[PDB]
Amino acid sequence: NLYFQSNAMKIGVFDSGVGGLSVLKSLYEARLFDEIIYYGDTARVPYGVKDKDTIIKFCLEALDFFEQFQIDMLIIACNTASAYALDALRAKAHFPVYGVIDAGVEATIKALHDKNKEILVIATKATIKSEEYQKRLLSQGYTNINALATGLFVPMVEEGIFEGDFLQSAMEYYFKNITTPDALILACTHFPLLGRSLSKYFGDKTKLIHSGDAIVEFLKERENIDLKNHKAKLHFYASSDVESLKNTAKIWLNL
Ligand SMILES: N[C@H](CCC(=O)O)C(=O)O
Ligand SMILES: [Cl-]
Ligand SMILES: [Cl-]
Secondary structure, three states, X not given: OOOOOOOOOEEEEEEOOXXXXXXXXXXXXXXXXXXXXXXXXXOOOOOOOOOHHHHHHHHHHHHHHHOOOOOOEXXXXXXXXXXXXXXXXXXXXXXXXEOOHHHHHHHHHHHXXXXXXXXXXXXXXXXHHHOHHHHHHHHOOOOOEEEEEOOOHHHHHHOOOOOOHXXXXXXXXXXXXXXXXXXXXXXXXXXXHHHHHHHHHHOOOOEEEEHHHHHHHHHHHHOOOOOOOOXXXXXXXXXXXXXXXXXXXXXXXXX
């Protein structure tokens, strides 16, 4: 006879490239889903230095890619995509689509629970320029905020630079004459890879807000998700050299 997917929770995760694995890791370890389809646009990455129209266009193409999979919802792991493409994605999609920005703001408010505390948001140029984090935080009365583009962190992470003198110099470059924040929002998929180094740089007064952990808490509240028995079945796709993506995933997720 014939069986089709019954009660199985299958979702898509989209990112501009490999960075989004940091979000995949959180979703995977949280045991929320039975199956996850990851797609990274590695042929065209990065998005963070490009313009709104291009970013939106690329995301809508990604939505097209996913429509062959019958997913229950789509997570936009990419902070840059989350900053620009959500309206357009939702207008087209007939399943829920969630980005990581709202979640990250919510996580920051839970961590600080004091609108007077200092927040530093670090992200790509496009994300900062969107003013999405700034507007959300301001609308909640959190006005003690700095928003800084720390663009070089993206290719440094891709080159495997997670500590050392060169990374210290990049941190000094971006953070010179910056006040030490009470919370640092890692508003870019690549930035958790630098978390240990960022925390050492700023010291123990600074709480790091991880976008992947944030979206996990957000999803548990917004959707009806029972914890699953096993880890999800993972499928990886990429617009270029998918084997490299899988390799990085095996390392980052300890598969
Ligand atoms: N995925 C992007 C970083 C890499 C890129 O610029 O595309 C983000 O989270 O902002
Ligand atoms: Cl969202
Ligand atoms: Cl908000």
